Amino acid sequence: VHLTDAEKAAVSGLWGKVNADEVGGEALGRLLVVYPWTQRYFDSFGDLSSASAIMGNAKVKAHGKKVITAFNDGLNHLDSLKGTFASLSELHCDKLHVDPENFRLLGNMIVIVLGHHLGKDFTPAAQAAFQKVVAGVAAALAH
Amino acid sequence: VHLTDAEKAAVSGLWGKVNADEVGGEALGRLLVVYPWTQRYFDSFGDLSSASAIMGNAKVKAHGKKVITAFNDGLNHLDSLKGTFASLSELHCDKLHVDPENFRLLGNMIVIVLGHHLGKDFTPAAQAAFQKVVAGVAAALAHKYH
Amino acid sequence: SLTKTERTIIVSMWAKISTQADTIGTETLERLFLSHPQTKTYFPHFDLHPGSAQLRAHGSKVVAAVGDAVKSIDDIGGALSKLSELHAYILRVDPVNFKLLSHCLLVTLAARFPADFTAEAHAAWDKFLSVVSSVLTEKYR
Amino acid sequence: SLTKTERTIIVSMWAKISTQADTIGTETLERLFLSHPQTKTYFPHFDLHPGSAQLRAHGSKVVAAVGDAVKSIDDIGGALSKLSELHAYILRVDPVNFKLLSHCLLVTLAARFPADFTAEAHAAWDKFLSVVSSVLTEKYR
Numbered sequence: 275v276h277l278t279d280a281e282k283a284a285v286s287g288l289w290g291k292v293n294a295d296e297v298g299g300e301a302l303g304r305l306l307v308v309y310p311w312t313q314r315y316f317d318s319f320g321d322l323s324s325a326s327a328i329m330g331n332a333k334v335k336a337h338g339k340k341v342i343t344a345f346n347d348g349l350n351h352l353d354s355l356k357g358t359f360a361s362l363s364e365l366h367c368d369k370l371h372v373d374p375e376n377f378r379l380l381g382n383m384i385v386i387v388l389g390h391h392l393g394k395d396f397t398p399a400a401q402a403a404f405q406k407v408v409a410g411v412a413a414a415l416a417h
Numbered sequence: 418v419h420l421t422d423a424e425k426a427a428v429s430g431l432w433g434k435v436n437a438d439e440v441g442g443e444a445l446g447r448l449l450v451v452y453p454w455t456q457r458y459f460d461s462f463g464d465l466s467s468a469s470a471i472m473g474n475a476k477v478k479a480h481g482k483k484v485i486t487a488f489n490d491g492l493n494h495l496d497s498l499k500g501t502f503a504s505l506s507e508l509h510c511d512k513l514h515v516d517p518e519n520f521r522l523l524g525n526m527i528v529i530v531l532g533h534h535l536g537k538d539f540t541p542a543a544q545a546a547f548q549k550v551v552a553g554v555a556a557a558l559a560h561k562y563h
Numbered sequence: 564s565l566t567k568t569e570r571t572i573i574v575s576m577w578a579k580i581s582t583q584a585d586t587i588g589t590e591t592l593e594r595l596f597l598s599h600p601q602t603k604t605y606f607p608h609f610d611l612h613p614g615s616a617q618l619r620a621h622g623s624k625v626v627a628a629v630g631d632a633v634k635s636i637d638d639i640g641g642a643l644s645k646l647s648e649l650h651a652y653i654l655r656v657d658p659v660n661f662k663l664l665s666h667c668l669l670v671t672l673a674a675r676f677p678a679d680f681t682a683e684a685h686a687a688w689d690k691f692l693s694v695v696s697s698v699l700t701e702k703y704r
Numbered sequence: 705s706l707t708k709t710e711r712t713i714i715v716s717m718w719a720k721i722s723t724q725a726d727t728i729g730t731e732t733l734e735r736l737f738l739s740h741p742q743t744k745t746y747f748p749h750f751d752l753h754p755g756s757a758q759l760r761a762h763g764s765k766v767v768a769a770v771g772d773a774v775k776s777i778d779d780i781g782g783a784l785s786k787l788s789e790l791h792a793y794i795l796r797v798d799p800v801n802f803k804l805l806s807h808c809l810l811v812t813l814a815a816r817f818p819a820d821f822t823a824e825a826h827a828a829w830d831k832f833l834s835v836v837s838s839v840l841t842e843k844y845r
């Protein structure tokens with residue numbers, strides 16, 4: 275989970291130009307829409323019967339906030355993802371029973387959303403940086 | 418990975434009941450047969466044109482021995498796989514460019530071959546134990562850097 | 564879906580599985596629940612203790628379904644078309660679980676019929692089970 | 705398994721992609737190579753440095769291929785037949801890589817057509833690219 279300073283910057287800058295909370299809610303929503311089975315862990319959130327519905331679901335956007343917040347924490351500690359997410363890991367593993375492959379999916383959703391918001395600013399080099407970050411976060415969560 | 422002194426005794430006892438070298442050679446062989454794209458990494462091994470040619474290929478067998486030796490190291494260091502495979506992790510990523518998903522596949526081949534060799538001895542519980550081991554090895558090999 | 568050589572292997576191996584279908588089905592599920600406990604979440608209504616009449620009955624149905632696919636191998640989807648909705652839209656089973664169950668069944672077969680479980684037979688069953696799995700998850704992709 | 709809507713979303717989005725085909729192709733590859741270095745080993749004979757002519761010429765062929773899949777959305781298998789044989793028999797590309805290229809294309813699309821890249825559009829394209837990737841790796845199954 276290393277990052278060239280040049281990259282360390284990109285992630286630091288670009289993550290600033292974006293509205294974190296929107297990213298999380300949109301990333302989660304895309305996850306539920308693109309991979310309908312991930313909905314199984316969210317019967318509570320209510321109506322997830324369709325895309326527009328899912329993307330407009332209050333409980334979905336609200337949870338994205340917490341997911342993006344946690345993601346942000348691991349973003350401030352790209353050197354200790356191990357313990358940073360350790361608590362969550364056992365929660366997603368032993369209590370929620372989420373197959374670790376899914377963490378990787380949400381990470382892809384986050385990457386796609388960032389490209390959706392930052393447009394041309396989310397360049398190849400920039401994506402690589404964030405991918406390494408995303409890859410690291412998912413690794414920690416499953417580990 | 419973390420295994421009870423029970424699972425560890427089981428893994429230990431069952432492992433002693435197989436020819437490690439054959440297990441490694443047959444697991445690698447099955448990998449090459451069932452997921453043919455993995456053959457791309459072993460062009461120097463010769464004839465891999467058919468399941469028969471693959472399973473009887475000397476280099477495939479010779480290489481399986483190396484794979485299983487490292488696997489055996491892991492069995493002897495379940496409390497520190499990350500460290501044990503750090504060097505192999507670097508080789509396979511930085512030098513060989515092997516997608517880590519394939520580590521899981523070879524891990525599955527080993528588990529299947531263990532069943533093939535042990536029969537009734539490879540109980541559902543024994544498989545579960547070895548499963549934690551193989552998952553641990555795969556993760557250790559995919560762990561970036563050390 | 565399968566070539567003649569693969570088809571031949573699936574049928575001859577099935578001839579053996581048929582006489583032990585129930586124990587194979589049960590052994591497969593138990594290997595799955597223990598090696599991949601996450602899968603247990605789909606059977607909260609089940610008494611997952613060994614020798615369970617509920618678990619054994621379910622195991623018989625899974626293998627029976629595999630057999631039905633073997634019987635009409637020229638059209639697997641038509642033989643299992645029914646099961647798709649249940650697993651995909653109703654149960655919403657994560658597709659990764661199908662690889663897990665298939666893997667566990669392969670371990671069971673390897674342990675049960677070592678002489679028949681050659682690399683070639685393994686390749687054929689892996690492809691066959693992957694076909695069965697896509698059909699059951701087709702309401703996804 | 706593409707609904708009528710999903711199919712129109714692919715056709716609509718394609719119209720726009722085809723007018724920026726060359727740049728979309730080059731950007732997709734750049735993202736792939738930079739974010740997933742393992743993929744570079746398939747092009748040892750290529751100049752993979754920024755603005756490269758080979759990369760640019762190649763990126764154009766890739767998008768053109770995706771276009772053929774759009775034109776033959778009802779039989780992607782037939783359309784991409786020649787390519788699936790090339791990628792499996794000759795190039796022997798690891799299946800996992802197609803998912804990586806698909807992800808990178810989706811990123812390029814979302815960043816280039818933000819208004820059009822809604823959740824539904826995303827789901828439709830992911831499903832479409834999954835079929836294209838499946839067809840290109842069918843020779844391993």
Ligand code: HEM
Pocket residue numbers: 312313315316318340341344345362365366370372376377378380381411412415
């Ligand atoms: C980028 C990866 C992810 C991160 C950082 C993440 C983070 C979180 C956090 C911080 C919580 C709140 C728990 C707390 O601390 O109180 C949570 C809950 C949860 N997550 Fe995740 N998560 C991730 C991926 C996933 C995935 C892939 C799934 C499966 C579709 C998932 C399913 C859940 C569920 C079911 C809950 C509990 C929700 C509830 O009780 O309403 N998460 N996650």
Ligand code: HEM
Pocket residue numbers: 455456458459461483484485487488505508509513515519520523524554555558
């Ligand atoms: C259980 C997982 C694996 C283990 C424990 C493992 C172990 C090893 C070991 C010990 C070596 C020899 C290093 C040396 O002495 O120089 C090696 C080499 C190699 N491995 Fe693996 N490996 C694993 C999985 C894989 C996979 C999945 C692939 C790709 C399909 C792969 C491809 C290679 C290649 C190409 C070499 C070099 C062989 C040569 O140059 O002749 N390995 N591996």
Ligand code: HEM
Pocket residue numbers: 602605606621624625628629646649650654656660661664665692695696699
């Ligand atoms: C080769 C793959 C599979 C086959 C052939 C298969 C077959 C079947 C069959 C025949 C039924 C009974 C349908 C009925 O009652 O009418 C069933 C039920 C069920 N399956 Fe599967 N299945 C497969 C994989 C899975 C997987 C991977 C899971 C999830 C870990 C799963 C979870 C369930 C559940 C929860 C039920 C409900 C049964 C009950 O309540 O009694 N199945 N399956």
Ligand code: HEM
Pocket residue numbers: 743744746747762765766767769770787790791795797801802803805806836837840
């Ligand atoms: C949506 C997925 C893909 C499409 C539509 C696609 C399409 C193509 C096309 C049209 C060609 C040229 C054929 C010719 O000139 O005869 C090609 C070549 C090639 N592709 Fe792909 N491809 C895809 C994915 C991949 C992936 C994932 C890789 C591996 C990282 C890959 C590696 C190659 C290589 C090495 C060549 C040879 C090019 C040369 O020698 O110039 N392709 N692909």
